[PDB]
C-alpha cells in the first residue's frame, strides 16, 4: 500500500552527508569541484543502497537494476539537493550542511545554468509546501521513471509505477487535501530536474575528460555508462 | 471555462504537413535530414502562430514570449510527432504522412536515441488512450512550463499554469473518469519529451555546424538561441 511504501521509503531515508570541505583554502574551480564530485560519490553509494529498498526494485533483473540507476543517478542527486535547499528560497544550494554555495560560487565552478535550474526548482518546492513523504515518493518515482524504453523487467516496473502513482496521490491528499493542482504542479518540476540532470552528467563527463578534477571509479563508471 | 480554453488551444493547432519528400532518391542520411529539417521549419512557423492562441500568452512581455518558444520548440515538435504516431504503437514515427520512419531509418540519420525516446512516449500515449483535447492541453503545458527560472512575466505565466492545470484535471475526468493515476502518469511523459528535446536541439546544432545539411534563417536563429 501507500502506507507500506512510505514506511519502507522512510526507514531507508538517506542520511545527510557532511562534505568536510576545507574552507581554509579559497574556493577555486578545482577546489570546489573536487568536494562536489566526491560528495556526489558518497551520496551515490547511499542512493544505490537506498534504491534496493524501494519496494519491488530488488525483484527487477540485475541488468535493469543497474540500468535504472545509470539513467537517473544525477537527477536523484539534484532532486535531493533541491529539497536540502528548500529553506534558502533559491538563494543558495546546500550540497552538504558543510557546503552551502550561492550564485557567486556557481559561477566559479561554471555550473550556473545547472544550479540556477535546481535552485528555482527548490523555490517551487518551498512554494508548494512539499512534505518529506512527498519527496521520498518523488525520488522513488524519479528512479522508476528513469527509462521510458522497454526493458526486460517492463512488467514489474509498470507495477511499481502504478503503486508509486497511487502513493503520491494519497500522500498529496493527506498533506494538501482537495488541491487538484498540487500533484500535477509538483510532477512538472520533474521535467526540470531531468533537464538539469542531463546537463549535469554532460558537465561531469567533460570534467572527467579534463583530468584535473579527480573522480573515483564509481562516479567514473556512471559517466562511462553513457558516451 | 475548461471548454473555452480548449477551443482556443484548438485554433491553428498543428495540422498534418506533408514533407513532399522525394522517395525517388535513396534514403541517405543527408536526404532524409533535409526533409526533417525543412519539415521542422514549417512546423515551427505553425508553433509560433499557435502559441499566440494559448490564453494569456500575448499578455506576456514580448521578450518572454520569444524566450518560451526558444526553450521548448523542439519539445513541441517531438510531442506532436509522438501524437501523430500514436497508431504506429512505437513502431515508427510519422513526421509527415509522406515521411514515416521506422527504426532502420533512425539509424541512417543517426537519431536513434532521440526517436527511440519519442517512439516510446508515443506507445505510452496510445496505451493511456490519450484524447486530442488532452494533447492540446499538453502542448500548452509544455510551452508554459518551458522555463522554471524567474522571468519578467512570472506572475502571468503562473496564472497560465494554474488555469491549464485546472483544464487538464477536468479534461481527464471527462475522458478517463475517476482514474487518479491518469493525469500523473501522463505528465511524467513530459520528462522524457524534455530529455529528447534537449538531445534534439544538440543534434541539430551539430548538423548546422557541419555545414552539409542546409538550415533556413528561422531555424538557424532558434538554434543560435542555445
Numbering used by the authors:
A (entry chain B): 248 to 474
B (entry chain A): 248 to 473
Task: Give the published text.
To understand the mechanisms by which constitutive activity evolved in the Crassostrea gigas ER (CgER), we used X-ray crystallography to determine the three-dimensional structure of its LBD at a resolution of 2.6 Å in the absence of any added ligands. The domain is in the classic active conformation, and the backbone conformation is similar to that of the human ERα (1.36 Å RMSD for all atoms). Unlike other SRs previously studied, there is no electron density of a ligand in the interior of the CgER LBD. Rather, the internal cavity where ligand binds in other steroid receptors is occupied in CgER by several bulky hydrophobic side-chains, including F425 and F525, and – to a lesser extent – F524 (using human ERα numbering to facilitate comparison). These hydrophobic residues would strongly clash with estradiol as it is oriented in the human ERα LBD. The resulting cavity has a total volume (168±8 Å3) much smaller than that of human ERα (402 Å3) and too small to accommodate estradiol (245 Å3) and other steroids. First, it indicates that CgER is an authentically ligand-independent transcriptional activator, which exists in the active conformation in the absence of ligand or other apparent modifications. Second, the presence in the protein interior of bulky residues that occlude the ligand cavity provides a physical rationale for the inability of mollusk ERs to bind or be activated by ligands. Examination of the CgER structure suggests that the historical substitutions confer constitutive activity not by filling the ligand cavity per se but by stabilizing the active conformation in the absence of ligand enough to remove allosteric control. Replacing leu with the much bulkier Phe fills this cavity and acts as a sort of linchpin that improves packing of these helices against each other, presumably stabilizing the active conformation and providing a structural explanation for this mutation's potentiating effect on activation by the receptor.
In vertebrates and some invertebrates, members of the SR gene family are hormone-activated transcription factors, which regulate developmental, reproductive, and physiological processes. The protein's ligand-binding domain (LBD) serves as an allosteric switch controlled by the hormone, which binds in an internal hydrophobic cavity deep in the protein's LBD; ligand binding shifts the domain's thermodynamic equilibrium from the inactive conformation when ligand is absent to the active conformation when ligand is bound. In the active conformation, AF-H packs against the body of the protein, contributing to the assembly of a new surface that attracts coactivator proteins that alter chromatin or otherwise potentiate transcription of nearby target genes. In contrast to vertebrate SRs, mollusks contain a single SR ortholog that is unique in being a ligand-independent constitutive transcriptional activator.
